[PDB]
Amino acid sequence: MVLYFIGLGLYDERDITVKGLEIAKKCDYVFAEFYTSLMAGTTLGRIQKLIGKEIRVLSREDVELNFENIVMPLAKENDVAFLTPGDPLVATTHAELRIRAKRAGVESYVIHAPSIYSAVGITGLHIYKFGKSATVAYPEGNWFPTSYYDVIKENAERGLHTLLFLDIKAEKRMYMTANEAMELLLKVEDMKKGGVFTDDTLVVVLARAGSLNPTIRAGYVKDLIREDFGDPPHILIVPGKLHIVEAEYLVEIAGAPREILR
Amino acid sequence: MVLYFIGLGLYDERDITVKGLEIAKKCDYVFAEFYTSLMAGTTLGRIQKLIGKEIRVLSREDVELNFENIVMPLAKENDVAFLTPGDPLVATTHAELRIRAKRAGVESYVIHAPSIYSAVGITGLHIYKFGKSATVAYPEGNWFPTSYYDVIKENAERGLHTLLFLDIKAEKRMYMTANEAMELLLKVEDMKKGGVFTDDTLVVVLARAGSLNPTIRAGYVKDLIREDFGDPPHILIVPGKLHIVEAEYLVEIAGAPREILRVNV
Ligand SMILES: Nc1ncnc2c1ncn2[C@@H]1O[C@H](CSCC[C@H](N)C(=O)O)[C@@H](O)[C@H]1O
């Protein structure tokens, strides 16, 4: 009579923690969602094979509207697991489901997994220097989101790095690329004109973190806005004031222009 | 010809990823450091038994001064694993080692694992609202550092949450408690008097993140400063104005006073 929120990690089925695996292997029913992020290095089958359980994949509507109709009932009589990409409570509204579980008399436990939020440490930027985070959202119809722009502004002023989660439309197999994010930013720039994001702004791109060879690139928007960073998912970062060791790593590992060394 | 940066996880020997465990098992040499942090929910022996290989422990001096002598050599002609708590490279300094590797013609790869940086999401606080992070350090001798205080002020001023790492003597295995951290911040409030941390400030304590039964508590400093949060490690969080969804979670899951639903939203 327990509900487990278990993370699957960054890239493939092996990014799950051993704790999460051994617990998933012994659950009676296993649910999961694959709309909050993209695990580009695996498939349901490989996940199922590793866990030895048939997994019922839920949609965003299933979760946000009928979680307590689809999952909780079984959770009151069995040991249920809910799987998600990366870490279940990072950049999702899943924490709310724990409130739903409690109100339903069901106990919930959380098993963490590698998250993009801390994986960005592989870019060499100091994790403690990241300020507020934001999401670059696809424009829909006449609605054109722009708040992420101000977030970068506020952080840069304080000399802090800005982490930008990129949009996703899982039902349409759409995963926003770093390129699309920059394009959208340049457009917000020409509208608000704040000297926040331009052709000369330094950005860091991290693609498919969790794989053995992720794409880690650093340079000026003018040089990267057209570069191919590989298949999604992608994460875009607008660094603030760089420490020497940070820029060095960016040069040695992310192939950044040495003109940032001064 | 390869060097593996493998993260060990949050608490115990099972917090490493399947990927990290299988790769470590296939490595010829396995190293480990426990001076950036410890793994309070387990032991070197338990980690060794799970990996099935001997683990040679490296000290700060071993790594920061002789990594090129002790590890890199073996990596040039073998598959070598370097194990560390949390997520590799989250610790400010380790990234530098990936540079040494490249120059020594040695491939290096990073195998990720959970970090408290993302694990704090279990507190119900939106990860995007976290601002600059800081470490609360013990005053010693004539030195009395107060920069973390300033970090809280700047983040809270912008409605952002502040993640505070608590001081740790890994070598001596000594943990600063959340209780002590609260006492220190109160003294800094007395010196700074900026109205950043007082008996009325709402804080969140997260202890033993990673274990199945962590301690998550939310409350006002006046009511938690003498509460027993259990065994270390302790992480202290000073949140900014709460989203109602956050306040609801802190009340229903972290036993926070209903009062936050109106006072801190
Ligand atoms: N492995 C990865 N590599 C690069 N970016 C990733 C990634 N995983 C997630 N992202 C970024 O994060 C966005 C989804 S938000 C969900 C993040 C997930 N809960 C976690 O903890 O990691 C993706 O659209 C992308 O912008």
Swiss-Prot record, chain A:
Keyword Cell inner membrane: yes or no?
no
Listed under catalytic activity are: 2-[(3S)-amino-3-carboxypropyl]-L-histidyl-[translation elongation factor 2] + 3 S-adenosyl-L-methionine = diphthine-[translation elongation factor 2] + 3 S-adenosyl-L-homocysteine + 3 H(+)
- Supply the SUPFAM superfamilies for this chain: Tetrapyrrole methylase (SSF53790)
Keywords, A to Z?
Methyltransferase, S-adenosyl-L-methionine, Transferase
Q: What is its EC number?
A: 2.1.1.98
Q: Which GO terms describe its biological process?
A: methylation; protein histidyl modification to diphthamide
Q: What class of enzyme is it?
A: transferase
Coiled-coil residue windows: none
The molecular function terms of the Gene Ontology recorded here are:
diphthine synthase activity
Pathway, per Swiss-Prot/TrEMBL?
Protein modification; peptidyl-diphthamide biosynthesis
| Amino acids binding S-adenosyl-L-methionine | L10, D87, V90, S115, I116, L166, A209, H234
| UniProt cross-references to InterPro entries, sorted A to Z | 4pyrrol_Mease, 4pyrrol_Methylase_sf, 4pyrrole_Mease_sub1, 4pyrrole_Mease_sub2, Dphthn_synthase
Which Pfam families would you find in this protein's record?
A: TP_methylase
Listed PANTHER family: DIPHTHINE METHYL ESTER SYNTHASE (PTHR10882:SF0), DIPHTHINE SYNTHASE (PTHR10882)
- What functional role does this protein have? S-adenosyl-L-methionine-dependent methyltransferase that catalyzes the trimethylation of the amino group of the modified target histidine residue in translation elongation factor 2 (EF-2), to form an intermediate called diphthine. The three successive methylation reactions represent the second step of diphthamide biosynthesis.
Subunit organization: Homodimer.
Q: What else is known?
A: The diphthine intermediate is not stable in vitro and readily eliminates the trimethylamino group. It is not known whether the elimination reaction also occurs physiologically.
Q: Which family does it belong to?
A: Belongs to the diphthine synthase family.
Q: What protein name is recorded for this chain? A: Diphthine synthase
